[PDB]
Write a protein that binds this ligand. Structure first.
Ligand SMILES: Cc1cncc2cccc(S(=O)(=O)N3CCCN(C(=O)CN)C[C@@H]3C)c12
Length: 321
């Protein structure tokens, strides 16, 4: 099938975005950094390890559902084009394409991410594996370029992994209204949401006894040190995984053991860390079944399917425009 990549990000947009996030994020109280910056090369290898950890259930909880329900997703959505808000490198991607292909209605795959190299490998993969499929990879980000996604016949947008949990309720509702707006009648959105559960089970999923999440979390300091000429005594920052009972969300913090002071060279900046001061690096909001349909209805979408794994740990929503 025909391949195409459209690149809406300038050659520097990545490093430019990094430069302002840590510049602004290190001057907040408390200091905070978006979780997008975890995922350099060693960060992605660390995450793929995380998905294989016994304690990290969401990855396998969502694959359990998708293995069982993919033909339903297809027959409900009846979509000829699968739009992935992600890299397209997972096996869940394949299960969704297989379902659409089995239905007989698969024409077009649209991977949508901010890394053209990943989009290209993905585009080659899907081209070698699915003759007949047009791959129209789009390289952009959500706030500006969701409008650049092609139209096709009838579109299944897919945002899995409970990645939507990284948006607190403000940006979450804003992200969904805008995604609802680029959607048109007949299109649907397939949404993965990790569910509220035993707080011990939640914290343990982000502080594995093996420490793989710990080095994954402090890898954002390794990224800032490398890409921006900084001097984080990375080991002096302790991994902290918190359950926030009032907000119902996991939080990953890096706690500074003793007073620290750090200079970020590319930004001519120096920031201080009090002894025991924490810096927020990721939020995973945990969800409730009807509250997810509610949020989808407030974005202008209407849920028509809900599914969980055998234990009720993870949920997948299907929502029509
Ligand atoms: C989904 C996605 C969409 N668009 C751009 C992306 C750019 C880089 C990485 C991903 S991502 O796929 O690597 N992503 C990241 C956030 C944490 N996530 C959690 O689940 C936390 N509990 C989910 C999952 C690991 C992107």
């Amino acid at each position: 099938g025909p391949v195409s990549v459209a690149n809406h990000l300038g050659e520097d947009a990545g490093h430019l975005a990094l430069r302002r996030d840590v510049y602004s994020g290190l001057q907040k109280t408390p200091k905070s950094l978006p979780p997008k910056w975890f995922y350099d090369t060693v960060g992605s290898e660390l995450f793929d390890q995380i998905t294989r950890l016994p304690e990290y259930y969401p990855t396998r909880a969502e694959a359990e559902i998708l293995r069982a329900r993919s033909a339903e997703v297809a027959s409900a959505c009846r979509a000829d084009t699968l739009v992935e808000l992600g890299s397209g490198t997972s096996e869940k991607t394949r299960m969704l394409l297989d379902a659409l292909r089995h239905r007989g209605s698969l024409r077009r795959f649209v991977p949508f991410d901010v890394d053209a190299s990943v989009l290209s490998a993905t585009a080659t993969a899907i081209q070698r594996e699915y003759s007949g499929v047009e791959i129209n990879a789009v390289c952009g980000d959500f706030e500006e370029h969701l409008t650049e996604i092609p139209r096709g016949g009838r579109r299944l947008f897919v945002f899995l992994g409970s990645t939507i949990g990284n948006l607190t309720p403000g940006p979450r509702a804003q992200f969904l209204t805008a995604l609802a707006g680029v959607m048109r009648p007949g299109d649907s959105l397939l949404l993965g949401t990790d569910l509220v559960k035993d707080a011990a089970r939640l914290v343990r999923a982000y502080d594995d006894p093996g420490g793989v999440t710990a080095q994954f979390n402090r890898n954002v300091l390794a990224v800032i040190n490398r890409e921006l000429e900084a001097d984080f005594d990375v080991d002096a920052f302790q991994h902290v995984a918190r359950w926030n009972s009032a907000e119902e969300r996991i939080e990953m913090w890096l706690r500074a053991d003793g007073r620290q002071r750090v200079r970020v060279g590319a930004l001519d900046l120096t920031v201080d860390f009090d002894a025991g001061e924490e810096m927020l690096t990721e939020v995973s909001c945990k969800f409730r079944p009807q509250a997810v349909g509610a949020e989808l209805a407030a974005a202008g979408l209407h849920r028509i399917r809900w599914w969980t794994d055998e234990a009720g740990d993870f949920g997948l929503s299907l929502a029509a425009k």
